[model samples]
Target chain A: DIQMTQTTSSLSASLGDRVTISCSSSQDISNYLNWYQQKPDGTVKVLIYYTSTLHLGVPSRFSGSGSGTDYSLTISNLELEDIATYYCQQYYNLPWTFGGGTKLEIKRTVAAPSVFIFPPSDEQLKSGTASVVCLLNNFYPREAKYQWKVDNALQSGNSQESVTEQDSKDSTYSLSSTLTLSKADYEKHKVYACEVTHQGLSSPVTKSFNRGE
Target chain B: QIQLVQSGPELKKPGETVKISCKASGFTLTNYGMNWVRQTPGKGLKWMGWINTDTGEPTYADDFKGRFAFSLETSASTASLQINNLKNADTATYFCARNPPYYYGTNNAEAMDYWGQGTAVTVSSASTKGPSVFPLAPSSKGTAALGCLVKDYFPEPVTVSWNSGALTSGVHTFPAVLQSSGLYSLSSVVTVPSSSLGTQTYICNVNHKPSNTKVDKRVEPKS
Candidate 1:
């Protein structure tokens, strides 16, 4: 059985950056080389084949070249969405072979943060603080800060976060934290708010019940 | 080292059975060991069962149990995947890979040490079973060029033939080409005599494999 020697095991690039991965076969594979893109989720798709023919649906940014025993895959202006582990396979001889893989991840100093908190419903506020909630729509690296404020002081709320395993309808994860209020920061005519902090953020995302009203 | 060279893409119908060919090389014929893999855009790689190269023993995966079969042509050092009861979901590329022998760790582990070029098969319900006989152009000096244009068929490996009255000539068959919609387009040109200018008509007969769906079309010589 032949072996595929991939040049790099991992690649780091910023958004809109460019990256290239190379795979060399142990034998003369001719033009029977194929490349694939496997996401963090373990899902894979072919990128290039027959040396340079990009598989159907593959974007123009990705290109392949070389023949015989040597071949390579190049990605131009790599988009953040293109960040994933890439692999190569040679179909020349008996029992196909695959390269180790190139894990392409976005090199970032900090994770981005976005949040959404609905105002206490006229219906919900009347009932109690349990009606208030904040949704952490989009965050990176799986780490974030959650806080509830009443009159400018940080308070704890019974907020639970939900994550995605690719089995969910959407690929991105969501966290909805229910605010357990002692008093309607609103009913008490006080400031009721939800604050979310991320390492990437300059400060934090602060939303209040009054903002929704 | 065992190598597998696969056939071209195929466009097939819902009810048709297609036979995909994988010709092996660089190894002895009897030592054939291989498996088939299914690939979808979102579903990823699926491990279909394999055919034993050395022993010819075969096994099918759960989903492929009822519809898929394995066959071989030892003389040609080739193996084939015959899929029956095809459906729209079967529209995807199929690849051929071989299981390694014990010397390589496991004799027929179905890991597929080697793979074919990956033959894409598209399944479309809107496929015509056979060709439509019609007039063709570009006739030679003393011969009439009658063509058979057959499209939108499924289940790979179909044969085409031409019949000219009682003097039915030997049919020159060409390999079928695959279409994006998962159907096949195949045409054959039969050169008959432009000499007679008689009332004899030409016919194109198509037999779509073991499915036995025979479609016959006849067209007259035009200029």
Candidate 2:
């Protein structure tokens, strides 16, 4: 049986931090790379395999993509309970083998800046008001951008927001914005999204919500 | 209805042993081989091994290299897995499967296509006999005795060994005894020292002669 091994830089990480691991095959396994997470005394959950297809019932933040002899398993926005060893296996031949797993440990780290929202003014609410708030707190290296979209269309006429330092010692940074919507405009929309872009990242992360019924 | 029905759950303690069975129905028993898989509760699937019913050939997965055996009774349409020296980690659900025959280029190799409902076996106790014992137990034991009646042996030629660790020497024979049912049974006995009890485990393996070595190992604890 061909053997595969996985190596990780560290055994621990904070929640929401990116965790990465690589799998290498003894021979070319094509795109048959599969990843599974085995929680302590729990069933193995298929995370990624056959390239990037997510298995059924898998969480969205867990994904995998790579090709040929090398593949990767990536967990975005890691959660505390996500603690477990992640394994990679190849299904292209007899005697399928799994790589040694990498365990992710949650540790104390600076919290990232966050955004908050408040109900629109009554006058604006009556006319169908819409608003968005952004908070920038504890973001390391301080490089982040936020965008708002209505009904999938990017909204314009917005300026670069500023972060304000707060008196609370734990408070990192905070930013906010509000958008007014006419009742007619609000009635025409179904959902809105807040896109947070971390520069140098491959994909801009998005948070979506539906309009109130 | 084509189906694979499995035996019931088993609970064994550490250091004890257990065996489970999977019986297939509504299909030609010799057409496909039975494949066994293991999955810890809430974990991913691990291929334990496969046993060819017609030829009685068995193959083990790398991780299952030791202490695992798969055997089958084609006439009874049943496959069995026996695990010995059980550990806490051995507790899990075991599944039996049949692979449809397929040709890989010129050579023929089968891949699993149908699966049996799993049998959950929990290892807990240290005793040798319990619900964890696979195939339950064969109806008869020892040698065929004189004037003794033998019951049906669907999977025949049951091999027997004495519990003593010492090997038996010299040719020993027993007379066949006939019973009122018109069947004959033969029995034999041997002696060994008490010291051998800890190291010896008596097993009665039954299968057609000249069977594939791989399939034979599946019937025992160590692969």
Candidate 3:
């Protein structure tokens, strides 16, 4: 009997990225490793057999490499439909065995955060100081970064505290960043703006609030 | 009661277009999606992808994204696969399978429970050739093992039947083996009792599907 162990348990990949999965046999099996793809619903098919030969009707993007005790399966320019569980089988010995599967998933694209600038805090405003909050909601890929701008200029010496929340329903993220400044300085500034950035976004999103309106 | 019945064999040339139809029975076509699978002789099975029976939206596997189309005739409860610009590699049996009812998000389907008898698709430059049968011969000494050889057949699917003079036991047929010359070869054997030797005739019957031909070869013991 032969034992095949998959080196990777799972992979998170994006469209067009190259992905590789590795398998190691307990003993040298030469070129007898075979790769199989199993859909989530349990439909199985052979992708590569005899270690490196792509099965008939298989796409060119899928390839197999390695020899002896180690083998790997590579997928070039991964497509959305390529998400599935892959396993390796070694048929060189009496009892052929399969490696634990590697589950391939899509690293979901980041969603652009919606930017909103909340008005200055009322209590702090009456005390001659206020905090402006930048609220960003419904973004993907988890985290976001923010920058404060006063009168179109990057602000300095401002105390900032950021907090993020998650909406359970959609699993999206929301973040609130606060900038505290004296009410007098707020009156002197023409506008206060917040720029938010996320990983998948092409450009930062900025929202501005006028001094009075 | 659910069944998927597919069309018959097709022989076509390279660059031609071939469409295979799969008709479903005992279930509403719109209630479940239909998936197409390709099975080549030694390569096992490949999933070509599935089509939404209700919306008519087809989703294909990465390999089949181009030149392959899935269509449906809801009124007749049928789904079809059309392959354009066919190549020699397209010579395989195509099967249509029924998926379970819609369970979740788009393009999600389960293992195929209902499947059509696969339709054979052959892409070649020549016409069909029926199998040539050879006379039955003894396989080994002091044994009733008789070997029947059938060779040089196109479209791969053929059946060999043996009649051993009122004897129906000890008949075995092997899988067809594709040869280097783009044809198939196979062997079937039957064992007869020594008492029946020289008194009974051993007949081998073969049915070739593509040519609609039947061949019967016989061997009699020497007097």
Candidate 4:
């Protein structure tokens, strides 16, 4: 098998810092580069490779653009959940090899994040209750704050709660949140968001969940 | 649902030899080839090599050229990796993967998508009287004491030792025996004074004559 060695024992990146990892093969591995994110204990997530194509479900901020023996894994806006080890693997030959990994960390201010809301249970809409709940799962940086918004306006008294937990691999952490609303809130084309904030980053990740009918 | 799971956790002494196995249950052994991969703690994946169960063709990565062999049992769908002359650096998780057939041009050179949980191996050594520096340690009566099991030997043996400033030497000597498996394992012992422990690090290096000598020699660690 080709032996692979990563240069740095560890690496640190701030929000929006360009991060790159170098992977060299004993023999030319062609351009079969593949990147993966390995949390301490969670499942490994594919990032980039084959020279720049991003994997499905990955954020647009994360991109890979490189070729041949030399390649780099780049992340534009490093989010808090991105604070973990990232590795590069070559799929060129019989024996694939991987780069040790670069662990990204939050450097500047905390970015408030949010997710698009999903409609409440089918039963709630059928019950004719004026109020309902929208769930926004898969947030990061455990301590993030949540909020509920209708149409383009922020709604007060709408309970926003966050749920924090560790990944299966115990390598990193994850967060989730829920927003409560009333049936009247969904009368029109309503959009709800759960916002989270942390240190050393700016801008909150706001995802708008839309409901039909 | 078929699956190929591996045995977990093995501790071997330096200069000793060990073989780790990955057994497949969900698929037929003859249909697919079993692949091996290495992953260090908090690192990326490294493809060690592969074993064709039907043809028994074992292609190893350049770094695994010497002392590492991949073998498989077609009937059982089990693949194994045997590393001789264990060392601390060999302590990493070894995994097994299944390689399904690929279309001639469509799926040429497909990468491993499914992987086995890894098995960890640690290397330690024991001496007759005390800690042994070399493979063979001398007994109290002056007779040479065999430290570990002597499997087979390599024709071109390589030795790793820290020189004046922790510099490691290249391949030094060949093994004393050869085995029928087309691989060799050697175990000898020699005593070293306790004072020398602080300055030396013993590494097991290998020497292999590749058909293509012009290939690049740089190796990347698993990401």
Candidate 5:
């Protein structure tokens, strides 16, 4: 009997990414390994058999490569629906065996911004023009827009905004915009707001500054 | 008698997937197949489903749907369980149980014959996560003919009983050099009177196996 060991536990990737999973066996299975595709939707089908031949009617992007004890399964141009787990089983022996397993997941490549508005920290609230900083944090993608509003109407003039690029570690970024307004304008009992627009966000993130006496 | 040594010890992150496997030692590969089952860390045993290693026949369990699958490698005497879109709910080990697969186009789902060692697939992230048979059409070509395509099905054991509005339940089943996809892709041809064309409905309720899903297809009268 042969034992297939798969240590490449988890994999994460976006669309069109190439993923390769492998299985190392205890003995020389000699291309006896078979690869299967299992979706979260519960469809388990054969992808490759005898190490590297594509099964019938299967997608072309899927291929098998390997021989002897070390065998690998590769799926190219990964699709969202391709988010699936795969495994290898060697049939060289009578009892046969399988590699532990490998799974491909969707990378957190796209994250929407979490937006917040820090109201005049008490001191600024009493000033002639109330100062407010709108913080848009933790969003994937490099570009995003910051908009200012008073009483639901878009504001004009006297606002500074900046957008920080997201890194490999932090998928996206955080942004901020500061706006100054008159205490008369702040006391109007109207909502002061900060809005953000990013390609990843289905809709803009808006925060309304509600004042308390 | 054979056994299933089922398992996998893989570290899968969130949204990742894993495949579990089992191989039978005592018996020949085609003589049996393995059905999938999930084993919770502390919770007891649960049943998944099975696949026909030689013929591509499949039967499943309730909880085993969506994000789960069963496949086989007959030459290797092995059976496998595949799961995708890993999540917390799916963070557990998987097991494969020995099942008596069909023998030479015969029906056999001998359940729980043996058990395999369970393999734990660590999914650190949230665990989440048939055929057609028919003919193009029928015409009154002097010799009226009706056919049933058991699309995506298998085994010569399939019985196609034809029931026509004005005809007999005459059946003509055929077998062939089985495709490596290893299903009963072979079809049958049923002949009837030309008068039966467009005037009578010819229906062939294909019977793959009793344990399999019921497939019924009828070609209604054009008239």
Candidate 6:
């Protein structure tokens, strides 16, 4: 099997920037390389086939050119809608192989999230326990770290999952984290805070919540 | 180190039955599933479906459900694709690939890691028809784009040439498109210098493989 490799696994470009992703095969593949674009929505489609010929419905800004073992896909005047992962595949040999994908992200201004802390409701206090939720919305770059604190001290058992969702309209992200507190702590009127650190922020943003307030 | 060796090519007439086999080695066939993929000149790649080697169950794509059957011979470590009542559209290269058990989220199935050497299946009746060639030359300021339209050919291996010779430069030959009548229609375009247009007579020679015939059409500069 001919091994395929893509040197750059991730790339960033601004709007209207020209970007090129390259792939190379171990042996001579002639012009048998094909390029495929996989969108964030999990839609995979062929962009170019037989090296240079653009696939049907592919835009003129997207083009491919190569010979032998090395090939590249170039996107001219890149648009925000063009953000996706690109892969190269070779059909020359029996075991068709694909290169490691290159993820293309757009460069934009960072947007810090609007943080909020939601305390347990009165009806939920009947369970003898309380759950505090920290929510962050409208953040850019999708990288945000958060921690739960009680009375300025660290707290554990706060689970984090794939709550981060990208907004379809503005390409911003929203995330949520949950922290469970004992009934005794709720009765003591402990102050719970959600401190979030984001690339767009100069310092950590904290939102406080208490049973009384 | 897994290997999948497939059967040889099959040339059958219409309404015939053809079965292609893929023999597995270096790994237990039952450990991983198997899938079949078909490729043609016009349609790039179509997944026929997959078969669970352990339980001997096959799932086929909608288009292949009726005429295609995936059968297995566990003792011999081989899987076969049997096409019943074949037609001209079934002419394609069939390949068997190993479908690993590992999978990710929805629509992100792990790709096939091991594949067999493809088996070409050619389904054609005895009568082969050569394409009807037509030439269209649209003249411009500096050059003329000579277009050759070849239509209604059977058995689908046709070569197009310009001026009794093979012209590779500034020439584009599109894939053979299947027509509604079960024939093929293909087009080739050649760009020639306008200075050499009127004095030079360009001929588009189309060679239909099965028919063993060549049809030529002369393309003249637009008046």
Top model number, lDDT: 6
Candidate 2 lDDT score at position B202: 38
Candidate 1 positional error at B7, Å: 0.9
Which ranges in model 6 have alpha carbons more than 4 Å from their true place?
A1-3, A7-10, A24-31, A67-70, A163-168, A181-189, B1-223
RMSD per candidate (Å) reads 23.7, 32.0, 34.8, 28.8, 23.9, 26.0
Among incorrect, acceptable, medium and high, the docking class of model 5 is: incorrect
Point out where model 1 deviates above 4 Å.
A1-213, B103-110, B127-223
For model 5, how many clashes?
26
User: Candidate 4, DockQ to 2 decimals?
Assistant: 0.08
TM-score of every candidate: 0.35, 0.38, 0.46, 0.44, 0.33, 0.46
Candidate 6 similarity to native, TM-score: 0.46
Tell how far residue A149 is off in model 6, in angstroms. Answer: 2.2
Off by over 4 Å in 2: A109-213, B1-16, B20-47, B50-58, B62-67, B71-80, B84-223
Instruction: Compute the TM-score of each model's chain A versus the native chain A and list the values.
Output: 0.51, 0.49, 0.53, 0.47, 0.51, 0.77
lDDT tens digits by residue: candidate 3, B99-209: 565444644323354668788898876557897665444311233545455656887688877763354455546556555467765656565665666677788888997
Report fnat in order of the candidates: 0.00, 0.01, 0.00, 0.22, 0.00, 0.00
Task: Please identify which of the two predictions, 2 or 4, would achieve the higher lDDT against the true structure.
Answer: 2
Give me the chain B TM-score of candidate 5. 0.48
lDDT value, residue A212 of candidate 4: 53
- Which regions in candidate 4 have their CA more than 4 angstroms from the true location? A1-30, A42-49, A52-63, A68-70, A74-83, A91-96, A108-213, B1-3, B25-31, B40-46, B99-103, B126-223
How well is each residue in A96-193 modelled by candidate 6, as lDDT tens digits? 66787898866657899767565654444565756565666667888889988888788875433234334445656666565656677767756788
lDDT of 5 by residue, B1-223 (tens): 5455665467677677787778778877676666665646433334566777668777776556787877887777778777888886686667666545434564332233355666777554322113345542343224444455453343334556666333443333444222334333444445566676766677776665632755667754322
Model 2 CA lDDT for position A75 = 83
Among all windows of 10 consecutive residues in model 4 chain A, the one with the lowest summed lDDT is A167-176
Q: Residue A62 of candidate 6: its Cα lDDT? A: 94
DockQ of each: 0.01, 0.01, 0.01, 0.08, 0.01, 0.01
Give the C-alpha miss distance for residue B28 in model 6, angstroms. Answer: 32
Q: Report the number of the highest-DockQ candidate.
A: 4
By summed lDDT, the worst window of 10 consecutive residues in model 2 chain A runs over: A114-123
